[PDB]
């Protein structure tokens, strides 16, 4: 349980590493969806960047973000388990 | 208001209404400093003010009316209901207010879904914050009512406090309806399908424990609150397959906390008069969709010809055979989802390896088997066939090799007998004829069919239109037309298929010059449901079914 | 009491103990123990002895060995869990 809580800081702030991949999903998403495919049919150098820091977090990105929801639960089936061993 | 040649001045003029509406509480919120009037209420510290939960009913009967005639590509809500939505989030961030902001939250939720346009107006992290109230209201705030019935004073409490959990199932009901409207129809992220289908565990996991704690058994609302989740479920299985195996992941797993007796696990009645649990309705609910195929026209360069019994004129033959292509994405892809439940779950409750299947898990398998069978002939459900077909071919595969336990040769048996003295006695006896509109109806039941089965062709056609009008508006079984037919065209193809049929397999394709004008969508009924049947491999290898009794009456053992 | 009515979980154990291991499930087994201990401690019901103190002693006993080994079987399955 210790270990999966620290797996859950880092999928957590990757839910703040993600945001980079959300803001520039938006911003992709937005930018070259409208305006480059309805009305006719800077933007590399640090994209490039962070799309290999992209690459480096799909290499942490063994995906277990399931993280929080699971470490609410078992915490709180660990704590029961607790108190029944003290009362046994 | 009311025209009986359009109705465009009733679009025009509810809208004028509604923006009415948005231009009157905008301008409110803005100039009301310390009114008090019947859209706002002043809080305790009187710098607050918030809505009526009147005024949220009457945006929500507005909207209810600009529904049935969709104005969202005629309405401006940027910076016009966006900052609606703020001043909610506002207040949401942070009895009496609880039941006011699931009114907010009902009425918001109405109020996303009404446009699809490409920018719809929300940035997919409000209406996660959404969830995340209903899941923080959900997990720690009905069992505060638990204690409050089961450690009260215990003097008339059992008729003192179910009423409020009564209401509360109610505006959680309504909730997860039209929680059920914006998953159907709009596209979602993935954070949150994965935290919605995280939510459904804990609602069988405290009704789980509510049925065990208090025996009163008067939770029909919890069967409510049940019902409307396995539509998402099912929704989100067709639509994104990228983690269409991870819901069934757990959809098996809460399939353990389940009642354990006979009088509580018997839950609401089907039309045929019989008493099912109705979690059981899930596993057929996900194969019911399957992903079944509907660009069913889109794949030939045209209709029928006029005489195919000599050449297929115009239209492609391999075009046709491309629908196999299709149908293999559906039947190696529905046995590969059976395959995970049914091995899963009788591998363990077959063998009695560690008290949980002799205790219970052998219990709770065998009535699912049941309630499938008294399930099966009824038409609102047409998986039940092709799931049961795969128990079969596990049976079967277990009482063969002698690798087994003395008990595990025993107790598979069983399951067949149950299998058997239903099917057996379910057509077979009955009818095993029509005489309305017949076909010959009398041939060997095995791989030899009816060279005059052009007549049942027509015979489908009731049951197709019959099956169109039955959930026109409705979504909750859309996915029962295209299956009941895709299922026998399938085999008419199949007919065709077979061997050496030198014209005789060409009146067939003059049967396909019937059917396939059907291409042309649709411009008593119950038995034609059943005859269908009889092309399964469950119906139709019954005497090499029954091999595995009659053949081993002797035995090398004698249990 | 706890032959004559059913208040009070001294008569459970006493079932417990009396009758057979079975005929109390793990929805009535989740009892108390200090409570049964401090009924023991004083003066038994109407037959002033001490077998049936012994009896109760067993059933306390047998209760107690049956909650452990349900306690041993939820935290293997939670480690069976928590593996995925």
């Not at chain 2, 506002?90 to 039941?99: A, G, M, V």
């Not at chain 2, 660009?295 to 005489?307: A, G, M, P, W």
């Amino acid at each position: 349980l210790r270990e999966l809580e620290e797996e859950k800081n880092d999928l957590a702030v990757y839910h703040k590493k993600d945001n980079e991949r959300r803001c520039l999903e938006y911003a992709i998403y937005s930018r070259e969806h409208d305006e480059i495919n309805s009305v006719l049919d800077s933007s590399n150098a640090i994209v490039k960047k962070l799309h290999k820091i992209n690459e480096a977090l799909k290499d942490y990105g063994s995906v277990n973000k399931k993280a929080y929801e699971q470490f609410n639960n078992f915490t709180k089936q660990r704590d029961s388990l607790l108190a029944r061993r003290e009362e046994l | 208001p009311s025209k009986i040649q359009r109705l465009q001045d009733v679009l025009l003029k509810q809208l004028q209404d509604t923006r009415l509406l948005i231009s009157q509480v905008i301008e409110a919120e803005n100039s009301e400093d310390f009114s008090s009037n019947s859209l706002f209420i002043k809080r305790e510290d009187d710098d607050g003010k918030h809505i009526s939960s009147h005024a949220i009913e009457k945006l929500y009967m507005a909207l209810t009316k600009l529904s049935r005639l969709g104005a969202c590509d005629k309405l401006l809500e940027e910076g016009s209901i966006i900052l609606v939505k703020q001043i909610l989030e506002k207040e949401l961030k942070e009895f009496p207010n609880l039941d006011f902001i699931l009114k907010t939250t009902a009425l918001v939720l109405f109020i996303i879904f009404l446009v699809p346009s490409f920018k719809k107006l929300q940035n997919e992290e409000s209406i996660l914050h959404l969830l995340n109230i209903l899941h923080s209201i959900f997990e720690y705030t009905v069992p505060e009512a638990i204690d409050n019935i089961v450690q009260s004073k215990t003097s008339d409490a059992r008729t003192s406090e179910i009423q409020h959990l009564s209401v509360l199932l109610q505006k959680v009901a309504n909730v997860l309806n039209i929680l059920s409207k914006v998953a159907h129809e709009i596209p979602l992220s993935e954070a949150v399908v994965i935290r919605i289908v995280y939510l459904f565990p804990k609602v069988s996991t405290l009704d789980n424990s509510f049925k065990t704690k208090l025996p009163n058994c008067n939770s029909s609302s919890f069967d409510f609150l049940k019902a409307p989740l396995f539509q998402t479920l099912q929704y989100l299985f067709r639509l994104y397959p990228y983690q269409r195996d991870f819901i069934i992941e757990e959809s098996l797993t809460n399939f353990s906390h389940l009642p354990t007796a006979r009088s509580v696990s018997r839950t609401y009645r089907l039309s045929n008069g019989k008493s099912i649990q109705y979690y059981s309705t899930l596993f057929v609910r996900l194969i019911q969709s399957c992903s079944i195929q509907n660009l069913f026209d889109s794949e030939i360069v045209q209709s029928e010809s006029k005489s195919t019994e000599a050449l297929h004129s115009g239209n492609l033959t391999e075009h046709l055979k491309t629908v196999e292509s299709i149908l293999s994405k559906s039947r190696h892809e529905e046995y590969r989802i059976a395959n995970h439940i049914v091995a899963y779950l009788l591998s363990r409750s077959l063998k009695q390896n560690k008290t949980e299947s002799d205790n219970s898990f052998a219990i709770l398998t065998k009535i699912l088997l049941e309630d499938l069978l008294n399930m099966l002939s009824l038409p609102e459900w047409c998986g039940t066939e092709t799931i049961i077909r795969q128990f079969a071919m596990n049976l079967v595969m277990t009482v063969t090799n002698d690798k087994q336990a003395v008990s595990s040769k025993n107790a598979a048996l069983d399951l067949i007998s149950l299998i058997v003295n239903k099917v057996l006695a379910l057509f077979d006896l009955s009818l095993f004829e029509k005489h309305n509109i017949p076909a010959p109806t009398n041939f060997n039941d095995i791989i030899s069919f009816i060279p005059s089965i052009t007549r049942l062709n027509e015979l489908s056609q009731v049951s197709f239109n019959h099956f169109y009008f039955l959930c026109k508006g409705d979504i909750s079984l859309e996915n029962i037309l295209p299956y009941n037919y895709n299922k026998w065209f399938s085999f008419l193809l199949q007919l065709r298929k077979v061997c050496n049929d030198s014209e005789a397999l060409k009146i067939i394709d003059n049967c396909i010059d019937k059917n396939m004008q059907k291409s042309q969508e649709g411009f008593n009924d119950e038995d034609i449901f059943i005859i269908s049947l009889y092309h399964s491999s469950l119906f139709l290898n019954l005497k090499f079914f029954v091999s595995l009794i009659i053949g081993f009456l002797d035995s090398p053992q004698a249990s | 009491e706890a032959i004559l009515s059913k208040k009070g979980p001294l008569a459970k154990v006493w079932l417990a103990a009396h009758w057979e291991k079975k005929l109390s499930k793990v929805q009535t087994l989740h009892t108390s123990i200090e409570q049964s201990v401090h009924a023991i401690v004083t003066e038994e019901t109407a037959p002033m002895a001490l077998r049936l103190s012994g009896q109760l002693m067993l059933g306390v006993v047998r209760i107690y060995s049956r909650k452990a080994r349900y306690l041993l079987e939820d935290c293997t399955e939670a480690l069976m869990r928590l593996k995925m």
